[PDB]
Amino acid sequence: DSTECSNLLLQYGSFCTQLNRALTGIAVEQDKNTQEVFAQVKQIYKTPP
Amino acid sequence: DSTECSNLLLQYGSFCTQLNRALTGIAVEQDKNTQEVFAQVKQIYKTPPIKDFGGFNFSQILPDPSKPSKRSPIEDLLFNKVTNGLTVLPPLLTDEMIAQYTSALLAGTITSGWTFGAGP
Amino acid sequence: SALGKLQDVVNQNAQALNTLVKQLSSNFGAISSVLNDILSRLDPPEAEVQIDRLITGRLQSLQTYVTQQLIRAAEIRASANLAATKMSECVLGQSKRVD
Amino acid sequence: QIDRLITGRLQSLQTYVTQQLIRAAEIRASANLAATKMSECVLGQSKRVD
Amino acid sequence: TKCTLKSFTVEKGIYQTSNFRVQPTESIVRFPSTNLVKNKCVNFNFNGLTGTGVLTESNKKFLPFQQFGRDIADTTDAVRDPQTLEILDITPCSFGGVSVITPGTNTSNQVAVLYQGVNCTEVNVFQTRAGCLIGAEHVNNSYECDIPIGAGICASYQSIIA
Amino acid sequence: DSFVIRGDEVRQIAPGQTGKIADYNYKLPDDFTGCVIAWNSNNLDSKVGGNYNYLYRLFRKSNLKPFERDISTEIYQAGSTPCNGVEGFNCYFPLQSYG
Amino acid sequence: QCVNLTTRTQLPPAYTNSFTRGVYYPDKVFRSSVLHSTQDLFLPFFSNVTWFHAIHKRFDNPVLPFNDGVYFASTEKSNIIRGWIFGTTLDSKTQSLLIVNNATNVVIKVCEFQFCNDPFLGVYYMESEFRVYSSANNCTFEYVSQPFLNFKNLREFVFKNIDGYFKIYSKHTPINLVRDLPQGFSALEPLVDLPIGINITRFQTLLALHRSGWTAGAAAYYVGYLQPRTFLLKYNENGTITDAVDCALDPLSE
Ligand SMILES: *[C@@H]1O[C@H](CO)[C@@H](O[C@@H]2O[C@H](CO)[C@@H](O)[C@H](O)[C@H]2NC(C)=O)[C@H](O)[C@H]1NC(C)=O
Ligand SMILES: *[C@@H]1O[C@H](CO)[C@@H](O[C@@H]2O[C@H](CO)[C@@H](O)[C@H](O)[C@H]2NC(C)=O)[C@H](O)[C@H]1NC(C)=O
Ligand SMILES: *[C@@H]1O[C@H](CO)[C@@H](O)[C@H](O)[C@H]1NC(C)=O
Numbered sequence: 001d002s003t004e005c006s007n008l009l010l011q012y013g014s015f016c017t018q019l020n021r022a023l024t025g026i027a028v029e030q031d032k033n034t035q036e037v038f039a040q041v042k043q044i045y046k047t048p049p
Numbered sequence: 050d051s052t053e054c055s056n057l058l059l060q061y062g063s064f065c066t067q068l069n070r071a072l073t074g075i076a077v078e079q080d081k082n083t084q085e086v087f088a089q090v091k092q093i094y095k096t097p098p099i100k101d102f103g104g105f106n107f108s109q110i111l112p113d114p115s116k117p118s119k120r121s122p123i124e125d126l127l128f129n130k131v132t133n134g135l136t137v138l139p140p141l142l143t144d145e146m147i148a149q150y151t152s153a154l155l156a157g158t159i160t161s162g163w164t165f166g167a168g169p
Numbered sequence: 170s171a172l173g174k175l176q177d178v179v180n181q182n183a184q185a186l187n188t189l190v191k192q193l194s195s196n197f198g199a200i201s202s203v204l205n206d207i208l209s210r211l212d213p214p215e216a217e218v219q220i221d222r223l224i225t226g227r228l229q230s231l232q233t234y235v236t237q238q239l240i241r242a243a244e245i246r247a248s249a250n251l252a253a254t255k256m257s258e259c260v261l262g263q264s265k266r267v268d
Numbered sequence: 269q270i271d272r273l274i275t276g277r278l279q280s281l282q283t284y285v286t287q288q289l290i291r292a293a294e295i296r297a298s299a300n301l302a303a304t305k306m307s308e309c310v311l312g313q314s315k316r317v318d
Numbered sequence: 319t320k321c322t323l324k325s326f327t328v329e330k331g332i333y334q335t336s337n338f339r340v341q342p343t344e345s346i347v348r349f350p351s352t353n354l355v356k357n358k359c360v361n362f363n364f365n366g367l368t369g370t371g372v373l374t375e376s377n378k379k380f381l382p383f384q385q386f387g388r389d390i391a392d393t394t395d396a397v398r399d400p401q402t403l404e405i406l407d408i409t410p411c412s413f414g415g416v417s418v419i420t421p422g423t424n425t426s427n428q429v430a431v432l433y434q435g436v437n438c439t440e441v442n443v444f445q446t447r448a449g450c451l452i453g454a455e456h457v458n459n460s461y462e463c464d465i466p467i468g469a470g471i472c473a474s475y476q477s478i479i480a
Numbered sequence: 481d482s483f484v485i486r487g488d489e490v491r492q493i494a495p496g497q498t499g500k501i502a503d504y505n506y507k508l509p510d511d512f513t514g515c516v517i518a519w520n521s522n523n524l525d526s527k528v529g530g531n532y533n534y535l536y537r538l539f540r541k542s543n544l545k546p547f548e549r550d551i552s553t554e555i556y557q558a559g560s561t562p563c564n565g566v567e568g569f570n571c572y573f574p575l576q577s578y579g
Numbered sequence: 580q581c582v583n584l585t586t587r588t589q590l591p592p593a594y595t596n597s598f599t600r601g602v603y604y605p606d607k608v609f610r611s612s613v614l615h616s617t618q619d620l621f622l623p624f625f626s627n628v629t630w631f632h633a634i635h636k637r638f639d640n641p642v643l644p645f646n647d648g649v650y651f652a653s654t655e656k657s658n659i660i661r662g663w664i665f666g667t668t669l670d671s672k673t674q675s676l677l678i679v680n681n682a683t684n685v686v687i688k689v690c691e692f693q694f695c696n697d698p699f700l701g702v703y704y705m706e707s708e709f710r711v712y713s714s715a716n717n718c719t720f721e722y723v724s725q726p727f728l729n730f731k732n733l734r735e736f737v738f739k740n741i742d743g744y745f746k747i748y749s750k751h752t753p754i755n756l757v758r759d760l761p762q763g764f765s766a767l768e769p770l771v772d773l774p775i776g777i778n779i780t781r782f783q784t785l786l787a788l789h790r791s792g793w794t795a796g797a798a799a800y801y802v803g804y805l806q807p808r809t810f811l812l813k814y815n816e817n818g819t820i821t822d823a824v825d826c827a828l829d830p831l832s833e
């Protein structure tokens with residue numbers, strides 16, 4: 001919550017944006033991985049009773 | 050162009066050489082990737098002038114003679130639908146040569162099936 | 170959105186280049202981001218410090234850019250190896266592998 | 269002093285994000301392999317040995 | 319190339335060895351001062367805005383308030399002269415990589431130089447899309463790629479041909 | 481390197497200093513290694529009538545190099561009018577004595 | 580000479596919507612076919628802009644704060660609005676800025692004016708009446724320039740004071756709307772940069788009387804206040820700002 005620290009951090013430019021974008025890419029990549037592995041069928045089949 | 054900046058930059062060593070070497074490795078890796086994907090045949094096969102394939106139509110995937118780029122209508126649509134010390138090196142294989150490789154692969158798989166991939 | 174996979178790679182490369190060029194506009198704690206302004210306004214004992222701050226900031230930016238370029242190069246190489254496998258097994262032969 | 273803390277924490281965060289990206293690439297490769305096994309071993313019978 | 323690779327024997331191929339930058343021939347100051355020199359790589363000082371570039375006549379339509387034009391990357395790509403109100407594009411001076419194309423030193427000591435992304439008129443001269451090639455003769459025959467140059471162009475030894 | 485200077489000029493015998501004897505009499509480099517030694521010599525290097533044996537370069541066209549010595553007793557042109565080796569209006573001797 | 584105006588009618592000032600007005604060019608840089616994000620002192624979109632009238636008997640010359648900057652809109656016909664007063668105490672104790680546009684030219688003076696309580700100009704039915712200040716002793720800056728200027732004319736101005744520099748931005752728009760601000764977009768061109776170097780916290784609008792007592796010509800003006808914020812400006816192929824986005828207005832624009 002230090003405003004002076006953020007003011008000094010703004011001198012370094014868009015490093016924080018790059019880190020956030022990389023983490024966002026990893027986060028959507030995990031969901032894409034789960035989608036590719038498990039969602040290979042569009043019909044939900046059931047066994048007979 | 051600052052001489053003093055370069056003199057101070059020399060104190061940090063061979064960082065610049067490392068970065069240039071890594072970028073050069075990536076640049077040659079892209080050309081190696083294109084060779085591995087598209088240059089799998091050493092014969093440039095061509096389709097016969099008469100397109101008698103027993104009812105099968107390949108006009109949308111074979112190269113169009115009317116177009117100067119010698120691309121297929123599908124490939125032409127694909128190319129239309131994709132839109133301070135930095136340099137962009139051109140790829141070793143140009144787009145017409147990559148299209149020629151795909152045309153050779155198409156001619157081989159249409160006229161010869163899978164035989165051209167395993168030998169004559 | 171049919172061709173999103175190629176456009177994603179093009180956008181990522183262009184965005185990385187734009188970010189790397191944009192990082193030159195940052196002073197990284199120095200008085201200015203322009204080298205000529207520092208060299209024309211200050212004596213070499215303190216201009217050396219300001220240039221050193223600019224050098225370390227720009228070098229960190231360039232190393233970061235090279236790092237994600239290498240990671241993306243690995244991803245593109247894996248995709249290209251998969252594409253070469255598909256070219257060998259689906260185009261040059263008939264594949265029994267499901268999907 | 270705040271600049272020293274900022275550069276240290278930024279270096280730590282860059283290191284963390286870089287190793288997370290490398291592990292993400294490894295997990296993506298493993299997931300691509302898992303999707304291949306799902307397609308070829310579960311949804312069909314595979315002639316590939318082992 | 320021997321100095322760059324740190325070896326007395328160089329294998330066959332292309333090796334990035336240096337960087338070619340077109341040096342500023344003159345320095346130009348324009349205040350509301352020296353003469354205005356166009357179409358050459360010169361240093362420029364327009365109203366305290368310093369830089370290095372090639373000044374060309376521009377077709378842009380700057381409104382009266384507007385003085386210097388910035389591109390996507392916030393670099394000054396167009397500037398208005400404060401004495402004669404005309405617009406000038408500022409193209410960055412020609413810079414490129416210098417690569418040395420050579421066969422093995424066991425075979426020959428002949429080399430060719432490639433200036434990447436540099437036209438041949440700002441430096442056996444052959445203009446390629448990859449850049450200007452000096453020392454290799456261009457032939458109309460097509461062979462397999464021995465040393466890759468780029469943009470469909472390759473080099474070989476038979477003298478060095480491209 | 482032995483010399484005699486004023487009491488306020490002992491701060492100028494240092495790397496990276498701006499000053500008068502730093503520019504026109506004795507310059508230290510930015511990468512200087514060594515020690516500067518200064519001690520008061522009012523009992524030896526001073527006279528009640530004025531000790532004028534110690535001289536400094538008041539006027540020079542450009543700043544010295546580090547470890548550069550100028551003993552040339554040529555006239556200085558401090559105005560637009562050339563001096564031709566003759567004192568006059570804006571024509572001064574470069575070496576002036578401490579009182 | 581000063582004259583008290585004692586025939587005013589008491590009425591509260593009105594309020595209305597800013598819509599997408601108050602955008603000015605943030606700098607002197609040409610940009611073409613680009614989207615540029617800038618953080619500067621801007622007027623927020625759809626903000627509450629204060630509305631003042633001049634109609635006959637309304638004559639709105641109150642004392643308003645300046646704050647970080649002032650957007651001044653004018654729905655004007657027949658040339659009643661003539662200038663502005665800037666300062667802190669508006670007397671000879673401090674140094675104040677005078678902007679006037681009389682029948683001939685535009686005059687800007689930075690002097691220690693002893694201002695009147697009701698500064699005004701006058702038109703006789705020719706201009707032969709000027710009662711703004713009683714004295715001017717210490718003058719540092721003078722600048723004489725060209726004339727800047729149903730309601731037929733729309734005048735937009737932006738006044739900012741940063742680092743001792745007074746930036747005035749202006750835009751002249753032909754309109755045919757009767758009462759309120761038209762809904763649309765028009766980027767304000769920079770008009771002048773003055774190196775006045777004085778403290779400004781309060782400002783005054785200068786009007787013109789009509790004499791044939793006095794009569795007020797039909798005019799209306801709007802006062803809005805600038806806040807530090809980010810806008811996304813769109814530059815077309817001709818270098819003109821054609822659209823803008825307030826980055827902090829709503830989540831869609833964010
Ligand atoms: C193969 O397919 C092409 C394209 O679908 C056919 O070309 C069309 O022919 C009809 C009839 O003359 C024209 O009206 C269309 O405009 C043509 N389309 C294009 C894209 O040119 C072609 O006739 C088919 N058959 C053969 C034997 O080539
Ligand atoms: C116009 O009215 C204003 C406000 O009533 C007058 O200003 C006052 O002047 C007296 C002079 O004795 C001062 O004592 C008051 O303090 C002033 N008031 C304010 C609010 O400034 C002004 O003098 C009037 N003009 C004339 C010509 O009488
Ligand atoms: C504008 O402000 C006034 C009071 O300052 C208030 O009564 C009015 O409702 C406001 N209008 C809007 C649109 O917020």
Ligand SMILES: *[C@@H]1O[C@H](CO)[C@@H](O)[C@H](O)[C@H]1NC(C)=O
Nearest residue numbers: 680681682683684686706707
């Ligand atoms: C306008 O103001 C200027 C500045 O004092 C003056 O010289 C000029 O005569 C004025 N014109 C009229 C019509 O009052």
Ligand SMILES: *[C@@H]1O[C@H](CO)[C@@H](O)[C@H](O)[C@H]1NC(C)=O
Nearest residue numbers: 671672691715716717718719
């Ligand atoms: C301002 O004016 C007053 C009276 O005219 C004078 O006494 C004072 O010295 C002036 N100050 C300056 C800075 O000119």
Ligand SMILES: *[C@@H]1O[C@H](CO)[C@@H](O)[C@H](O)[C@H]1NC(C)=O
Nearest residue numbers: 666667668673777778779780
């Ligand atoms: C400007 O004036 C205001 C009120 O008179 C005061 O609070 C402020 O400190 C002044 N600023 C400067 C820079 O003089």
Ligand SMILES: *[C@@H]1O[C@H](CO)[C@@H](O)[C@H](O)[C@H]1NC(C)=O
Nearest residue numbers: 379814815816817818819821
């Ligand atoms: C830009 O100006 C040209 C005139 O050369 C005009 O034809 C075009 O419509 C203008 N573009 C816009 C968006 O106004």
